[model samples]
Target chain A: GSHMALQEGVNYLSGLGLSRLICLPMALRAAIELNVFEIIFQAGPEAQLSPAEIVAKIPTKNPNAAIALDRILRMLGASSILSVTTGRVYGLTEESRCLVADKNGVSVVPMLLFTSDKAVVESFYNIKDVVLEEGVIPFDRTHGMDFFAYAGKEVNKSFNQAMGAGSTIAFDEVFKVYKGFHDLKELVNVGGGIGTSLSNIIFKYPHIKGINFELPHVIADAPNYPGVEHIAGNMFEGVPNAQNILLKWVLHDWDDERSIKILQNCWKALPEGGTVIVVEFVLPQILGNNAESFNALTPDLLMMTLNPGGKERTTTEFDGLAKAAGFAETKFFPISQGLHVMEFHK
Target chain B: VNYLSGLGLSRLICLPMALRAAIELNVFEIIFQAGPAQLSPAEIVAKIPTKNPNAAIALDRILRMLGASSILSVTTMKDGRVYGLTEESRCLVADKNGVSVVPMLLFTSDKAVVESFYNIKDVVLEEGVIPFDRTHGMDFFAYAGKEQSVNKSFNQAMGAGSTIAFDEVFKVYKGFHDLKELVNVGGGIGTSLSNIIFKYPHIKGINFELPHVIADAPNYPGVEHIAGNMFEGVPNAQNILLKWVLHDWDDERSIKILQNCWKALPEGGTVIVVEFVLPQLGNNAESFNALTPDLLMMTLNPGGKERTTTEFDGLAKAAGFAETKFFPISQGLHVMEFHKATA
Candidate 1:
C-alpha cells in the first residue's frame, strides 16, 4: 500500500524477478557439467534432441532422468540458451553455440564455469562484507586470499583453459572483419601477456613476422614460439618497430593519460600508412534497450567490483584517446558484444 | 556477441547477489527511513555503519542495479541523483504493525540456501538425493532443527510474510468467517492462525505442527498449539488449513498428507491449501515468482513442486475429494479448497 513504481516507467517487477531467476545459473551449471552442449553440438548442424534422447546419451540410471532433464532444458529453452523445437526437442541456439569446443580445443565452458564456480558465486554473498570492510574484494573475503592465488594454485589449469578461450575467440572472429594482415610485413602485440594471440596469429598467417612486445619481466618467461620474437620494451617510452601494432586488451589497464602516452610511443614506432589495431569492447555511451546492452555493461561493473580502477570506453572515449595520441584518422570494426577492432592511422 | 552475452549469462548471478547485498546493508530500509523521500548515495552511506572509506561508491553501484530493474525509483534533483522506494522496495518497509516481507527476503538471500544450489547437477543426474540434502548432508527440516540460525530464518520467513498475506487473503477467501474450528496443518509457532483468530474471534484456532516447532510457540489467546506430524495423522477440526506446506513435497508424499487430512475431516469439512498456483505459461513481468520457486522446490525438496490447477485437482482426487475450488488471493499466491463433494 505504501509503494509505487518509478513514475514514468514500470520495472520493479523485473527487479523482484531478478532474484527469482538466480535459479537460471544453477540450472546452467549443471547442464554444462553434464556436457549437454557438447552432446548437441556433436549431433551436427540443425540436429535436435528430445529430453529422452539427451538423457539416453548421458550416463545415468535414473528412470526419471528424462523428466528431470526436460525440466531444466525447458527452463534454458525459455531463456533462449537452447531453442525448443516441435515436440519439445532442443537444438543449439546462437547463444548455446559459444559453449561448443572451438578449433583451439576449448569452449567458453571453463570461463562460464569460473563465473558460476562455488568459490566465486558464493563469494558474491559476502559483498556487504567487502564493501563495508573496505579495500577488500568479495573473492578475497570468501577464500581468505586474493583472486590470483585462488586461480594460480587451485584452478590454474581449468581457469586458464577457460580464459584462453577469450583470446582464441577474439582472434578467430577478428579475421572475419580485418584482412589487412595480408600486406603488413611485421606486427607488434603491445603489453601482450605470454604472447597467446600473436603466437596463434603468427601460426595462422606465418608470412608476417610477430613481435611479442611487453615489459622485460614479461619477456623473461615467455615460451619460445616459431615466427614470434619476445621483445622487452616499455610502451610509454616507446614500442617496438613494426608495420602495425596490436593492443589486445592492453590499454584497458591504463588510465587515459597513461594510455595516451603508450599510444604516442606506438604512433612513433609504426611506419607511415601503418596502424595501431586496438581490440576491446567499445561500450555503448548509454545502456541500450535489449539484453545485448545490459550484457555489455557488465565489465564496467566488474572493473569497479575488482581492484581495477580503469573503465571500459565508449566509441567517443576511444576516439578521444586516439585523437589526443597524435592520430589523424581512426576507423571502427565491431567484432561482437561491444568488442571492436578500432584502428588509429599513422 | 552471443559469446559476450553468454558471459553475461554466467555473471547474471550478480543481480541476485547485488539484491542480497542491498538487503544485508539495509539500503532499502535506509531509503525507506527517508519516509516518502529520496536519498543520495552520500546520504545513504552516512546512514550505514561501515569501516570502508568508499562505502558511498559501493552503495551507488549496488543501488544502480535495482534502479535499472525498476525495483527502486531514481530521480535527479539538479546536480545530484537520489533514490526512493519503488513499489517493490515498499515491501521492505514495515507496515503500521512493524511487519514487512524483509524477513522473507532475508531467508531467500540467506547463504545457507544459496550455498546448497550448486548441487543441482548432483541431484538432477545422480538418482540419489536433493541438492539441499546433498549439500547439507541432511534434509532441510533436519538441518533446520539442528541449526538455530536456519531455524530462526525459517521461523521468521514463515511467520512474517503471512501477516499481510492473510490480510489480502480475507478479501477473496471470505468463507472462513462461518467456521468454528480451523486446524492449521504444519503451522509453525501459530503465527498465522493467531492472526486469523484475532481477526475472527468466534473461530477456535489450532496450530498443528511438528513437536520441536510447537515447543517454541506462544500461547495465543483463542488458539491451541498441538504438536504432531501431518503424515501420521492430523488433529480433527471442522476445517483444515495447509498454508505454504504442500509445495515442499512431491505428490507421492503430498497425497499422504492430504489423505490424512481427508480422514481428519467431518462430512462438512474442507481442506484449504495456500500456495502459489502455477499458471500454464508466464507472460513477461509476472508469475515467475512461482515458476522460479517451482524449480528451486525441485532441487531442495525431493518431489516438491508448485502445482497447476490440474495438479491440485489430481492431489485432491487421490486424497478422496473429487471436487475443488481455487481462490485468487494476492500476487502469485492462491487458496485452493478441496471439499466434501464441493458443498
Candidate 2:
C-alpha cells in the first residue's frame, strides 16, 4: 500500500507528458493542406474517408504515404479535430467542418496555419528569453520587427486572412443576437483593417456612416470598401469624431495606460451618450482546463509573443479602462463563444 | 453553444514551452535543492541569475502551469504560493546519482528537436525528407554528433532513463544469468550494459557503439567499450542485447541489424531486443506510449516504426531466427527474445 502510491505518482505525470507536444497542430496543418476534409466532403455528405482513400486522392509518390497519413489523421482524430471511425475512416464533425474554408475564404483554417507557421512557432523556441526579458515580445526579438509590421509586409496573408474571417464570423453572430449597432448615426472603427467589419456593419445598418480609422501604414494597404471611409490617424493621440466608436479586438494589444489613452481618445471623439462598442474575449485566469480558458490563453500567449505589453483582460480590467477614460456606465452583452460586446457610454 | 475543450490542441506548444522555460532556467533544480521545503516563487527567483524584476511573476505563472498538470506539487503558504517537487519533477532534477530524466526533458523540449518536428508535413508528403533532416540539414545521428550539447542531452537522456528502465526490465526477466558474454548494440557509454554485468557479474559486457559516441563514453568497470556499426556487424557474444535500436529502423534496415546479430550468435544463442511493441490496434496506456513515439520515429528517422508483436516477430523470422518470444517487461517497453534453436 505504501509503494502503490509511488507507482501512481509515476503514472500520473507520465500521462501528463502527452500534453507537451506539437504533434496534433502539425498534423492539423498537414490535414488542412492536403484538403482531407474537402476530399471527404466531395465524396458525399455522409462519407468517412480512410487515410488510404485520402492518399489516393491526394496522390503521393512516397511508399509509406498510406500509413503516414493514417498516423497523422489518427493523431488528429484523438484530438477530435476530425471524426474517426472503423477502417480508420475520417469525416467532418461540426468542429472539423469549420476547417473547410467556404466560398469567401472564411474558415478556422488560416488561424491554425498562421499560428503554427514557422515564423510564429520559431519565436517560441526562445521562450526562455521571452520570460527572462519579461517586457520584450518574442516575435520582435526574433524577427527584429513587430508582428503587425511583419504581417503588413506580406510576411503571410494568413494573418490578416485569419483576423478578417474571425471578424466576419463573429460580427455576423454578434449582429444576429445584439441590437447595439442599430442606434448609431455614425461610427469610427479604430484599428479597422481594410474596413471589412465596418462594411459588414454599414451593410446591415445602411443609415449609419462608417469611417475606418487605422494607422497610416495599415490604411495605405487597405483596399477601398463600399460605404466605408478609410481614415489614417494615431489612436493614442485622437480618433475621428462620431456618435460611436468600435474598438473591436483592439485593447488587448495594449496594457492599461496605453489602452486607457486610446479609450480617452474615443471619449473625446464621441458625443454625449455615445457608446464605444468594445469587442474582445474577456479573460479569466487565462490558463485553465476548460475551453473558455483555452480560447483566452491560446490567443493571450499568441499576443504575448507578437504584441508588446499585450494581454487579455478580465471584466474588471475592461471596466477600469472604461472608467479611467471618463465613461459613466459600462454595459455588456454576451455574444457567441466567450466574446462580449461591451458598451462604454459617456 | 457547447464548444469542445478537447480541441485545445494547437496551443499545447505552450505547455512544452513552459516546461522548457522552467528546465532551461533551472527552476526545477532550485526547488529540488531546497530539500523537502516548499519555496515561494519569489524565493526560487532569488537563486536565478536574471536582472528582470518580473522574474518572480514569470516563474509564478510557469510554476502554476506545471502545478496544474501536477508535474510539480503546489501549496499556498501564509505569505504567498510556494512550489515543491512532485515525483515527475524529482526525476528531472539530476540531483540523485546522475539518474534524472532531465536530459530526456531537455532533449525533447530543446529547440533543435522542437523545431525539427515542425516539418511533419514535408516529412510525409515529400520523398527523402526526414522532419529532423529538413530542419537541421542533417539526420538525427549526424546532428547529434555535430551539435555537442544536443548529443550530450540525448545520450544522457538514454543513460538516465535506462538506469530505471533496465532495472525494472531485469526484475522479472532473467535471461542475463545464463549468458557467458553480452554485447549491447548501439549502447551509449555502456549505461545499460554496465547495469547488466553489475546485476549478473558472471557475464562479460561489451558496449558497442559508433566511433564518435565511443570517444565520448566514459569507462564502466565491468563494461569493455567497443566501437562499430550495427548495420555492418555486431561484436561476437553469446547473448546480444539491442535496446531501443530496432524502432529507429524499418523492415529492410532492421533486417540488416537482426541478421548481423544472428551471425554473431552461436547455436542456442539469443538476441535480446528491448523496444515498444504496439498491440494490433488500441489506444491504451501502453499503446499510447508505443504509438505516439511511433510518430516521433516518423519525424526523426526514415521508415522507422513501433512494431506490433506480429510485426517484430516477422522481422526476427526473416532474419532466420528459429524461435521468438515477446514479454511486456515494463510500462510501454517490451523484451522480444529471438533465439537460434539448435538443429
Candidate 3:
C-alpha cells in the first residue's frame, strides 16, 4: 500500500511536468563542484557516507556550508543521482558513478560542466523570446556571440575537452555498432578537433589510414597519433581527399544551407563510392515515448539556443540535406546514446 | 542509462522557468478564462503583454513544454496547434478563495530565486549566508518589504498554500472539535483562522500577528484580530496554533516563541504546531515535497528548516512541553501537539 501510495504521489508530481526536475541541473552542478561523487566513490563501492562524513571529506572554505551541502546531497539522492540509505548516508549509483573518473577515464562531468555553464544555461531562459521576436539564437542574444565563437574566445579548453570526452564515449558505442569504418582504406575526420575520433578509428581498424582535419589553429597544437595524419584546413573551403570521410558530431552546428554547402564540398573531395559517414542525433519524428525522448528534445532545444539556425534533424530532414548535397542515397543506423550513423554516398 | 544522454538534465531549469514565464504572462488564466474553446498560440500571445517580436513562437515553445509536462493539453486543429488547461493547470487560475498556487510557483521561481540558485555552490562554500542574501545583497524578508509586488505575491502564495493544508486538516483531524478558543500565532490576513472557525463554528479564534499585519487583517466570523509578537507573549487561549511559524526562525527564537505559548496556556491546554514533519529519505513524494521546501528555507530564511520527529521532540522538550503527539495532515504536513511538562 505504501509503495502504491508512493507511486501515486510520484505520478502526481510527474503530471505537473518538469517543474520538479528543473532543479536537477543545479543539484548536479553542485554535486560535481563539491566532488560529492568522488567522495562517495573513495568510501568504497558499497560504503555509504552520512551527511557529516561526506561533508568532512569535502573541503569547503565556509565551515557553515555543511548544512547547505547536506541539503544538496539530499536532493542528489532523491533524484537518483546518488543512492541514499538509512540515516541519510549516501553511496554511488550507476548514474552518480559516471561523474567520477574511472579506469576507463570516461566521465560525463566535462560534458555536464559545459552544458550547465552559466552562459549556456542562462540562454535557455530566453529561448522562447529568441525564437519568436528576435529570430536570433538564445546564446548569441545572451552572450553577444554564437556558442562556437564564444567558446573559441573564452572557454576553449573546457569546451574542447567536453567534446573530446563526449566523442570518446559516443564513438566507443559507435565503433561497436557500425563496422563500415573498418572496410575503408582511408578516413578523413572533418572538424575533428585534436583528432580524438580519427585516433580511435585508426587504433580500432589498424590498417585504415586516418586524416585528422580541422581548423589550422586547432591542428597546430594537436598531438601526433601513431597511425593518423593531421591536416589543417576548413571543411567549408574543401576537404582532403580520402576513400571515406567521417563527420562525427558535425552538421548539427549549422543551418541547412551551410550544412549542405559543407556536405557538397565533402562530395567534391571524395571519389565515387566513397561513403561519408555522418554521426549525430537523429531526432524521433514523434515525441515522448520514453526517457530518451527527453534527451533528444532537450538537445534539439540546446542546438537551437546555441547555434544560429542549428538543430537536430529528423530522418526526413537529414535525407533532404543529403539529397541537396548530390548524395544518391542515405542509410540510417541508430546507435547507442540516441545517436545515429548515416552513410551518404555519391 | 544512456537514455538520459540528451534529456538536457543540465538545462532542465528551462522547463520550470518556462512554466513560471507562462504564469507571469497569465497564459493559464487567460486560457482558463477563455472557456471551452481551445486558443492558438497566436491568440494566447495576443492576450498577454509582451514586446518580443517572436512572441508567438516563444509562446508556442512555452506551451509545448507545458503540454509535454501535462500542465496544459494541446490539440491540433486545421490551422495550427491549440492549447487548453488540464486539471493540474486549472488550479493555477487565481480565484476569490486564494486557492490558486500560481503565485506560489511564480514567487518560488522568480528571477531572484533562480539567480540565488545559480550561486548555490557559493552558498555551500561560503556557509555563513544564504544564497538569497548573497544574490540580492539583502535578506529575503527585507527585499520583500522593499518590493510591494513581491511582498503581495508572497502573502497570496502563503495564503494559497495554507488553504490546501487547512482543507486537508479539516477533513481528517478532529482536534479542533472540542477546542474553546484558539490563537493563530503569526496569522496573516486571518486566512487559516477564518477557515478553521468556519469549519468548527463552536470555537472562537484570535488572529495574533504583528501591528502591521494585523492592521490589514480582514474581519472574520468568530475571530478577533490581536496585534502582538509571539516572542514577547501570546494571548491566553485553550489552544495556541502556530501554523507554519516556527520554521521561519532558528532554534533559539522558535524555543522562545514556544515558551511564550506555554506560559500563556492554561493547565492541560494544547499548542498545535502545524508544519512539515520531515520524513526519512527515499519515501517518494512526501519526502521530496518536504525536502524541496526545506532547501528553499535554507536559501531564503536566516535559520529556517523542516524538522524530523526527533528534532521536534527536542524542540518541545526544550520549551518545557511534556507530551508531544503527531497527527499527519497531508503531503508531509502534520499537526504536532505539545503540552506543558508538569514539574
* Most TM-score-accurate candidate: 2
- Candidate 1 lDDT, tens digit per residue, B109-183? 567777777777665587757888878889988888888888888788778766756766876778688889899
User: Candidate 2's residue-wise lDDT over A1-346, tens digit each?
Assistant: 3422333224322432353355555667777888787788777756788888888888578876777888777766655557778658887776676666566656666667777777877787665665687677788889988777777675446666566666776676788778978877888899987677888898799988899998666776666767798998878778888888999889998878889999999999988878889988877653435556666666666676677777788888899999999997999887755678899999
The TM-score-based order of candidates, best leading, equals: 2, 1, 3
Where's the lowest-lDDT run of ten residues in candidate 1 chain B? Answer: B279-288
For every candidate, the chain B TM-score is 0.92, 0.91, 0.87
lDDT tens readout by residue for model 2, B36-90: 5788888988898888887786667566656655667767768666888875566
Q: Is the docking of candidate 1 incorrect, acceptable, medium or high quality?
A: acceptable
C-alpha TM-score for every candidate: 0.81, 0.89, 0.81
Q: What is the interface RMSD of each candidate, in Å?
A: 4.3, 4.4, 6.4
Q: Give the number of the best model, judged by DockQ.
A: 1
Q: What is the C-alpha RMSD of each candidate to the true structure, in Å?
A: 5.1, 3.5, 5.6
RMSD of 3: 5.6
Model 3 interface Cα RMSD in Å = 6.4
On lDDT, the leading prediction is 2
lDDT of 1 by residue, A1-346 (tens): 4443222222222333444547777778879988888888778947999888888888988887877776677677766678876447888988788888766575678777866667666667766765587666766666777554465456544544454567777777788767766777788888776677787788778887888887654565566878888887767778877789988776765558888998999988888888998988665534433554555445544544432234567788889999999998999988766678898997
Q: Model 2, stretches more than 4 Å misplaced?
A: A1-9, A12-20, A43-47, A93-95, A102-105, A154-156, A216-224, A285-287, B1-9, B27-40, B43-47, B63-95, B281-283
lDDT of 1 at B198: 78
